[model samples]
Target chain A: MSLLPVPYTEAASLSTGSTVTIKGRPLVCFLNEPYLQVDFHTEMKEESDIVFHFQVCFGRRVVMNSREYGAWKQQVESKNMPFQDGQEFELSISVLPDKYQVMVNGQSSYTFDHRIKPEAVKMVQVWRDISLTKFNVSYL
Target chain B: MSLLPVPYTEAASLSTGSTVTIKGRPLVCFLNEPYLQVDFHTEMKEESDIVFHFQVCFGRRVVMNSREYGAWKQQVESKNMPFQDGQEFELSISVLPDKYQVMVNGQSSYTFDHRIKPEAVKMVQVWRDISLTKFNVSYL
Candidate 1:
């Protein structure tokens, strides 16, 4: 259990059967509506297009989308809440053939159908309103 | 310059002549649309009523508002941006009798009429997508 930086970034490649596991805690109480975002991008640059964008407004809602060619696609919004207030959370995102499955604390919470091939992701960034303790991508 | 923690909070009080000054840099490039927020609260609690809420979507726009009785009031939006992408910025918020004047990098950029008296502020929070080097309040 090591502390990592906020706005953390790593060069990554995802494919079917790959999983990203992140352990973190919100920096503020849920009443403040803190946010957490994880983006799978096409390149190492922060400005690169994203193949998957997952954002959570703590205690509010979750939004999923993609950015292609400098524009955002339709957003998928969910009202399902699984994260606990003032508690650390373990988030696991699995890349499937057609969708990405997100599990919060071992419970299936949300999923996003792939808009682009997972192999297109060359980088992954996790940022906003949280302190990260662990981040790992499953090895082949 | 000493580095302060992100999501910094300080118990503060204000008057007509008080000024809060901050020097910070966005965690990501402007293309990522980083945010900077300053909230003057009635108490040290994050959920406490906000006398002034100022948020900047770097390279885009700014939004100003107040939250009273657990509800957000009218929001003021502006497109005037004086922040440079990827550069550190010095921000000063001066309390006036009728308004809060915000100066960015030495330029008078925006102002928000006080919806609540400056004396009501007991805490100030600066957070979101930034690394702060300096934060000071002009003491009476």
Candidate 2:
């Protein structure tokens, strides 16, 4: 198989305060040489509350937070506070079957339960101001 | 921050051989999107028999290879096999600090030690057919 190169520029920006859907397989990102970095970013509208739901698959494990919304909210902060327009925020995620770690702006933001059915997370849907920039996907 | 789009065709065509020494900060390939793919093609010459080493860093936790030489050998039918000239192989690597699983030609190839000291892997270099054909990089 041939590897493909992705074009990245500051102009390709996603809009805030809107929902975006992403489709494709997952891949790994490496930061600091050979270490992989898992992160996602999106824009948020000022004074608007936003929520992000993800289905993360690693090894044979799959996890998410939609079906288990109640449990997730109890253990993690599901609601994103007021976001500023055109502001860029990064979320670092650690995915596991039982728990999920969420990092905002390069810092630990919160941890929540794997609420959604792991299989359902195959499609990641975001509500409000979450324009995706890029991704790293690999087949199993 | 503005998002840039990287094309797969350009990424797949990079060839880095005869690069004996790599200087400067570690290269970063960031996965901006939730899904992306990458491929690297390389051969292990006697002088450069060591396979490429990798790590997955998430927050404070890191995952990498455990066994040294035997890891790739046991997984890849020994690193001594002559890589067919101009023959390219696709590798699907799943990132995790505790263990990084690699697939070559859609088959399970090897497992790498995570978070090991960099000096221990000094001989391993990604050169020649090795190309960063996918993802976005942040080189420091």
Candidate 3:
């Protein structure tokens, strides 16, 4: 089968500065089956608190945000709780119109609100020092 | 500190017929975490055709015999799924006023609507084939 990049179809290894988008409707990635996810990764800096920002838009409603409330704080704290350097970690976000469920290292870490229009979420971007492996977007 | 159940708390072991009001809401224990999940153990009789019934009451709105969907069919068809007995699994449900986010083996597996009135969710029950490991509820 031809590899599609919309939902992570193939395990695409990505490094810093890699970006991709889904051209169609929202897709699901099986972070662990029955459950699906879409994720990004970043490098941990000594004494540095890294932040990730993304929006989940269902139509025009922005339902999740990386900032505001304790969700993001909890996520960062939980994901990096161990704070091990050089150990690659997977950061995933399950995109729903109203909420973005975040997972780190195969565990559900946080749920963020999308802060923009769903149509605006057509593209997903990752910044800073990070690497990406495995991308598949599936439609149900 | 008194142990108050929070949303993200890993469930401790629970027994059959045990009912716990989490976050002041009613939830029942059918199966607990760290136990063999039926999903990985038993094969469904039909594909795209297995449905289980449940009931919930969120007050005056009582949901009974609500059919919950399963992925057994898809799993079987893919030939990539396996069934094994005595395999331990974990199941969790994050209850909301309107619905429940059910996680099986730490992965989001099912979504069930609230049937009881939000204020009336003060009881939970478990059937014969389930056990619970821990329970925590959080709200802020």
Candidate 4:
């Protein structure tokens, strides 16, 4: 894994039909909710809008959306949050032909269809406040 | 995603397109060579023989082979080792019609063709000394 095992985001060029796995937990003395966002950056320009946005709002929600031209878009939410603030977690997002398969824990859970082609996803941003133990974004 | 994020070999029922992901690393303070093995158990009512042995011997070589009726088959090797000792990594082994697609760090990297039927091999064993952080076997 070329990415550092720290807290933040960076540009990613993943092979097609690969899976993105993040291993982490809430920091000690954790109080507020933590979030994990994996997005497909639209282009080369600064502050580029994301083509596909996947945000997990810690306790009770997971939001998905897309930003094409800087304006905000609708949110895709699921109340089933598989993450616990005090425990470590594994989240794997698999890339497919038509959608992004989101696995929470060990189940065959969710799939996010491409708002942007998987080939066009140049960067993946893991934002907000999340303590990371392992950052592995590789091919599947 | 129904399986517990723990260790051990277990029964799995899957179709043609299935992916097994392991997120972990060679144990810290890892001195000797590291080995991680994933195999398909070919028998049902007895101690099933492994039909596919995918083993990574540190960053040196990845050995692949099969066992049946107290006998062993040919070995397969790949020089592309995406795993490092004392550091974390992600490995995905996907089931295909003619082969098993193995990915190191997220790409659709390697494949092990069928030595046995994809469905007949019901159980999968991930063993050896590699420290495991999480094990996920899910359908694609």
Question: Could you say which candidate leads in lDDT?
Answer: 1
Estimate the TM-score of every prediction. Answer: 0.94, 0.25, 0.24, 0.45
Candidate 1 residue pairs in backbone clash: none
Model 1 global lDDT (CA atoms, 0 to 1): 0.94
- The local distance difference test score of each candidate is 0.94, 0.29, 0.30, 0.65
Which ten-residue region of model 4 chain A has the weakest summed lDDT?
A: A26-35
Interface RMSD of each: 1.2, 15.1, 16.9, 19.0
Task: Write model 2 residue lDDT over A97-120, tens digit each, in one string.
Answer: 555555555555456554432333
Candidate 4's DockQ is: 0.01
Off by over 4 Å in 3: A1-83, B1-140
Error of 3 at B20 (Å): 65
The order by descending lDDT is 1, 4, 3, 2
Compare the candidates by DockQ and give the number of the best one: 1
lDDT of 1 at B19: 96
RMSD of 1: 1.8
lDDT string, candidate 1, B10-71, tens digits: 99999999999999999998877789999999999999999999999999999999999888
For each candidate, give the TM-score of chain B.
0.98, 0.30, 0.37, 0.83
Model 4 lDDT tens row, A1-140: 34353324556765457888877665321222345566667554325777677776577577788777776577777887666667877888888888888887776667777776767766675543345666667874
Error of 3 at A28 (Å): 30
Candidate 4, residue A48: lDDT: 74
The positional error of residue A76 in candidate 4, measured at the CA in angstroms, is 62
Flag the better candidate by TM-score, 1 or 4: 1
